[PDB]
Amino acid sequence: HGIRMTRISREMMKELLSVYFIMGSNNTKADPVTVVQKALKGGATLYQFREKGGDALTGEARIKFAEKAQAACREAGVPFIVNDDVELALNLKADGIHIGQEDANAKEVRAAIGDMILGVAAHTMSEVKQAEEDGADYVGLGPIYPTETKKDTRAVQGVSLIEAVRRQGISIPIVGIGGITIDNAAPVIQAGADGVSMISAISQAEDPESAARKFREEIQTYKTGR
């Protein structure tokens, strides 16, 4: 994955969303970069650098951690997506940026990043359609299930929005997020999602590599079966 000179295709974007690992240093008790490396080795298809909050690294320390995580992704041949930080994404030549509703304006971000991958968090039909109109390459829908990893969370919606979006004929790449585990991932794909994203199921697993591998196998099976 080099410098993109064209918008990513729907097909490729959907493949990348399969097992979307998201992590910051405060999401694990182990060595951060090591966990990322293990998740990639196990089979994560996309990684999002999400380092924020009172327990996260800041300044130069955060930037250096970002560089190492990006290096790990490059070694695994997996794209590196930055959460919220547009400047960081541009400075590191990340493969993409993921933003939320409270964040900035998707239209503005799309203009600033050229043909880089753009993900937008959406919780309602209106937000999903607006994200598509603004030029997002994918939307993250959730919380699907209960989760404490992110406290300022919206109401749990199961796979309701995913189904609604598909029923309306919207084909934008979708990834589910929120309390997803190997045990409850299948229904997310069955509802019409193109993959699952998670933090704790992998970051806090006693065996992150095996957890990621189990996810990879499960998701592939269900994509073929739907």
Q: How many residues bind ligand TZP (CB under 6 A)?
A: 14
Q: Which stretch binds Mg ion (CB under 5 A): 61-69, 73-81, 84-92, 122-130?
A: 84-92
Picking from 223, 157, 154, 161, the residue whose alpha carbon sits closest to that of residue 195 is 223
* Joined tokens for residue 137: 């390459």
The listed partner (ligand TZP, ligand ICP, Mg ion, none) that binds 175, CB under 5 to 8 Å by sort, is: ligand ICP
The listed partner (Mg ion, ligand TZP, ligand ICP, none) that binds 153, CB under 5 to 8 Å by sort, is: ligand TZP
**To the nearest whole angstrom, how small is the minimum distance from the Cβ of residue 123 to ligand ICP?**
9
Cβ 87 vs Cβ 61: under 8 Å? no
Q: Which stretch binds ligand TZP (CB under 6 A): 70-78, 156-164, 195-203, 213-221?
A: 195-203
Helix-helix angle 32-42:59-76, to 10 degrees? 20
Q: Is 119 in the site for ligand TZP (CB under 6 A)?
A: no
Contacts of 52 (CB under 8 A, 6+ apart): 24, 83, 84
Picking from 95, 82, 84, 110, the residue whose alpha carbon sits closest to that of residue 13 is 95
Kindly state the DSSP code that residue 117 receives in the 8-state scheme.
Answer: E
**To the nearest whole angstrom, how small is the minimum distance from the Cβ of residue 26 to ligand TZP?**
12
Q: Is 157 in the site for ligand ICP (CB under 6 A)?
A: no
Picking from 67, 109, 60, 58, the residue whose alpha carbon sits closest to that of residue 86 is 109
**To the nearest whole angstrom, how small is the minimum distance from the Cβ of residue 187 to ligand ICP?**
17
Site residues (vs ligand ICP, CB under 6 A): 20, 22, 48, 50, 83, 98, 100, 119, 121, 140, 142, 175, 177, 197
